[PDB]
Design a protein around this ligand. Structure first.
Ligand SMILES: O=C(O)[C@H]1O[C@@H](O[C@H]2[C@H](O)[C@H](O)[C@H](O[C@H]3[C@H](O)[C@H](O)[C@H](O[C@H]4[C@H](O)[C@H](O)[C@H](O[C@H]5[C@H](O)[C@H](O)[C@H](O)O[C@@H]5C(=O)O)O[C@@H]4C(=O)O)O[C@@H]3C(=O)O)O[C@@H]2C(=O)O)[C@@H](O)[C@@H](O)[C@@H]1O
Ligand SMILES: [Ca+2]
Ligand SMILES: [Ca+2]
Ligand SMILES: [Ca+2]
Ligand SMILES: [Ca+2]
Ligand SMILES: [Ca+2]
Ligand SMILES: [Ca+2]
Length: 480
């Protein structure tokens, strides 16, 4: 049943400290085995406790707080508070709080008239220990003017849902998902925050980020990252729809993550690249609308690169691996670099740079003048048995516009395929054109590239850069 706050002494007048009265309703709801704590319209002032871990209000299992709506019910920290406050509404440290939530209310951190790191909504059990909160809901909720973190569900929370909510004008990050498991952020807006719109961090996995919007933030619109410590990377991160635009850094940044997906998003107006991918094992970048990024300088709308943490906390080198980039509309250059394993990399209207590294890769440039780089003779080859797998294929090579970059391979030019030349051949059925080194190396391998289509007559020497000098003259991108 319902427990109205005013029936416990809450005023909601903007002056009286209602922390005890509102906490009384929570305790009554928790003691009743569960219930809804209801707040009619008004601004309810609230103060913290002795320590930061006390937060301000402590929500408990099976207790739900329902206000009169965003802007109508406002829970605001008192003027003059000067202590770190981890969660204006929070669950208890060391307790597995479950089946609780908050709806239709505004949390105001009052950073203008307070000092100290303030977080709005804090969940979780115990940092670096096993155990979790679970079944946590936030619906139609505004968190604003907190000095550090607006929505800050923390380690660990399972089945957190935040939908139709807003975080804005917060000191650091509007949304932080810190070791969230099996959780959903849907149809949220995070804007004009000090650093990040959304920040998924600290081993979070199986996260859906659907139709979220982030703009005007001082840093990334959305960042998915390991964080500063040598712990398990996040994985299984599905970013669907929404829009990440006009942010002070990349629109979407993903680093040291496994099996990430970014699909159907509108990404524009950011100061850095629209999408940046740094050492990600399994990356899908499909059907996005990416334009007018790198407003603060920069040469690329999309950046795929490694993450070298050898001098960092983990001491490891993290390659970007198992990448699929298809169907994107990109009004600018895409830098699509991957490594060992099969990669499918499609460029777009821009002058793109493509390199699948080791393994059998399928590359396509799309519109514009694109450079297909082959950095190592073992990145595309046919073996002693003639096994045509491990040979790359370029779908749409356009003679006179695109470029094959062999500048590091040490071949002199086109020829009969021996003595450092490459032979230009056509397969029997007329469907594929091969660049082949007929000279086997010590392991029986032949460097070889397949070009879909018949290009033995249209492809000329100026379409291939065989050394650094030729790459300087013929390079179609400024990304090298
Ligand atoms: O990696 C990056 O790139 C980012 O790193 C960011 O630094 C993060 C850290 O990595 C963590 O995420 C950190 O999480 C904090 C969290 O913000 C809270 O401060 C929390 O505080 C709890 C204490 O750790 C402690 O467990 C405490 O237990 C109490 C208990 O409640 C009770 O009172 C009992 O009687 O006594 C114990 C006690 O030991 O005192 O409860 C606290 C609580 O609030 O629940 O601790 C975690 C933590 O990991 O320590 O937050 C920082 C951060 O600043 O965000 C950051 O640098 C960012 O810029 C980077 O991007
Ligand atoms: Ca808890
Ligand atoms: Ca202040
Ligand atoms: Ca590859
Ligand atoms: Ca292109
Ligand atoms: Ca092209
Ligand atoms: Ca390859």
């Amino acid at each position: 049943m319902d427990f109205d706050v005013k029936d416990f002494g809450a005023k909601g007048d903007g002056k009286s400290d209602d922390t005890e009265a509102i906490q009384a309703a929570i305790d009554a709801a928790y003691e009743a085995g569960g219930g809804t704590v209801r707040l009619s319209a008004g601004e309810y002032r609230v103060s913290g406790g002795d320590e930061a871990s006390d937060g301000a209000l402590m929500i408990k299992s099976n207790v739900y707080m329902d206000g009169a709506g965003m802007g109508e019910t406002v829970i605001k920290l008192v003027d003059g508070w000067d202590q770190k406050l981890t969660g204006i509404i929070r669950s208890k440290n060391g307790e597995k709080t479950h089946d609780y939530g908050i709806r239709d209310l505004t949390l105001d951190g009052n950073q203008d008239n307070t000092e100290g790191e303030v977080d709005g909504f804090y969940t979780g059990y115990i940092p670096r220990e096993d155990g979790a909160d679970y079944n946590v809901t936030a619906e139609r909720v505004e968190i604003r003017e907190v000095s550090r973190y607006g929505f800050d569900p923390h380690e660990q929370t399972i089945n957190l849902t935040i939908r139709d909510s807003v975080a804005h004008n917060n000191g650091k990050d509007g949304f932080v998902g810190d070791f969230q498991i099996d959780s959903t952020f849907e149809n949220n807006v995070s804007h004009d925050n000090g650093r990040h719109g959304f920040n998924i961090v600290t081993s979070s996995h199986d996260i859906l980020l659907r139709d979220n919007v982030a703009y005007g933030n001082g840093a990334n619109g959305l960042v998915v990252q390991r964080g500063s410590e040598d712990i398990a990377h996040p994985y299984n991160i599905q970013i669907e729809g929404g829009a990440y635009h006009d942010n002070g850094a990349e629109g979407v940044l993903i680093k040291m993550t496994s099996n990430a997906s970014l699909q159907g998003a509108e990404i524009y107006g950011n100061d850095a690249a629209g999408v940046r991918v740094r050492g990600v094992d399994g990356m899908q970048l499909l059907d996005n609308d990416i334009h007018d990024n790198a407003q603060g300088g920069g040469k690329a709308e999309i950046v795929l690169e490694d993450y070298d943490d050898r001098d960092g906390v983990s001491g490891n080198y993290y390659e970007t691996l198992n990448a699929t980039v298809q169907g994107n509309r990109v009004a600018g250059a895409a830098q699509l670099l991957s490594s060992e394993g099969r990669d499918l990399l499609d460029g777009a209207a821009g002058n793109d740079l493509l390199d699948g590294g080791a393994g059998r890769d399928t590359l396509s440039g799309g519109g514009g003048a694109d450079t297909f780089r082959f950095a190592d003779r073992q990145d595309s080859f046919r073996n002693y048995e003639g096994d045509t797998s491990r040979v790359d294929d370029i779908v749409d090579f356009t003679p006179g516009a695109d470029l094959i970059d062999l500048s590091g391979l040490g071949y002199s030019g086109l020829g009969d395929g021996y003595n450092g030349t490459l032979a230009l051949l056509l397969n029997e059925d007329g469907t594929k054109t091969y660049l082949k080194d007929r000279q086997a190396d010590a392991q029986g391998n032949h460097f070889e590239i397949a070009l879909d289509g018949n290009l033995v007559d249209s492809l000329s020497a100026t379409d291939i850069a065989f050394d650094a000098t030729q790459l300087e003259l013929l390079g179609t991108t400024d990304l090298q």
